[PDB]
Amino acid sequence: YKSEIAHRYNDLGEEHFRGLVLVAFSQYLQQCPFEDHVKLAKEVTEFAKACAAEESGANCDKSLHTLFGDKLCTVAADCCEKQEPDRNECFLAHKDDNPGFPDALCAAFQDNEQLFLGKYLYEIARRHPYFYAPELLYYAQQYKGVFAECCQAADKAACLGPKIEALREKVLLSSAKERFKCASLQKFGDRAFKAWSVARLSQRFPKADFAEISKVVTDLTKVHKECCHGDLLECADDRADLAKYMCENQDSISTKLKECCDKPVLEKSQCLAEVERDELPGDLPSLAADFVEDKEVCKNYQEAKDVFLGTFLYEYARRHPEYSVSLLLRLAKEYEATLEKCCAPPTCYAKVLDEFKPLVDEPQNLVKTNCELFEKLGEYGFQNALLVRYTKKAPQVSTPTLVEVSRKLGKVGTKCCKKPESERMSCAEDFLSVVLNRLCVLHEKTPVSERVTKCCSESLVNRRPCFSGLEVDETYVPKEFNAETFTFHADLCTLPEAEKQVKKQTALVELLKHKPKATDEQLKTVMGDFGAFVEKCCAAENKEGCFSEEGPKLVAAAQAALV
């Protein structure tokens, strides 16, 4: 109350506080030295620590942003002269996503652990300026755990290799997901998120009353709202409080929550987040009897629209674990929109009930078909298919972007396509919702396609629908073949396959940018000839060298195949 920095210092603790501040500066500035950030992060916590004792020390009276902003502005800047709650908005809009940035280690673990774990937070945070900081702290203590497990062992890279990567992937995905959440919260607004979380947790927690879930969602909303606005201390704190509340009344929400609440701190906050769904109790009326069969649905709808629709979202969501969170939201939107029409008459909205079936069917078909295809070519070929696809869809977009997001798109198949069929559609699009966001978040700063920004700006829920039905773009004026995109290097055959695939794919994107209306076979030819070219020349020893025949044999064969 009387001192907020002291409040958060008291509630969170010095270490988590310090870490969180370090993250804050890392995310906000991104561009500065590590030590320079540990300096500030060190000095702020001392002020906090002093004011945890003496709450009436000067400047401890202030709000967190008031201090934080001025203390930012001390760092050697048009953003700093707003000196209003707009400080942040400037500081927040100026956050660079896609910013660049590319026993010896363990020796430093024992020497200066806190520093070692600090730099992790720094590195991760500056890459991902919208990271769920608490989660990042969890990942930090995991990072602590790794070397403890492996650094005091005979073989290092064996037990260190896979676990670092395994952690890393889970860092990446986390970043992406939090970015989606905050994207909804900032670009689209409260209710979108406050609709999303309902369906999500309604799936997750059936038995739960709509009221209980409503509270949980309100709280979660608060947490992420402040968390992704730069209010990281409050986010962490309220997250902890939320987990407390969740674990307390578990018997009122879910049976499976017992496992998590025995953790120490951040751990239950993670378990809970990654706990699965309790058994649906049914029971369960028709769902027709009320929101369809009833003559009073509209009388009840008009009294409280958002409650009614929220209740419909709850009721429908819990009964269908197999539906994607996006789908259910589209169904809720359809229901609402029809209720806005049918209403101001139980004879019309007796037909809304199956207007869903198409909306349910299109995704299902999409997922099954793309999975069918996935089983055919595997991840790589799936990525290439999606690559060609999205190059056709949005050929004005940056190549490296079009590569990245297509790989991310294809990886979905590896995540959630070998699952039980019943589980395929739910996952596939939940992540698609995450991957797609990044296509646009990357597209916002540098926009070049009306259809992409439109698609991603119109509706939070109808993003995939717009992205899959997006036809081939004929407005696009294809550029002539530049010989330099097809200039190559000996290294090509020295490279690791993993980073070789990118080299193969970038060219394919660049290939379609020249002829977007190309055919399956037509591309297959050049994909064969490219192979032919690299294998003859790279095996050609004294090469290359041989690559000096780059054009006259390959491109001078490729452009013909593409007529």
Numbering used by the authors: 3 to 78, 88 to 113, 121 to 362, 366 to 584
The authors write:
In the mammalian circulatory system, serum albumin is the most abundant protein (typical concentration of 2–5 g/dL). It plays two major roles of (i) transporting diverse metabolites and drugs and (ii) maintaining colloid osmotic pressure of the bloodstream. We have established the efficient Pichia pastoris expression system of rCSA, and defined its physicochemical properties. The primary sequence of CSA indicates that the protein is a single polypeptide with 584 amino acids 533.
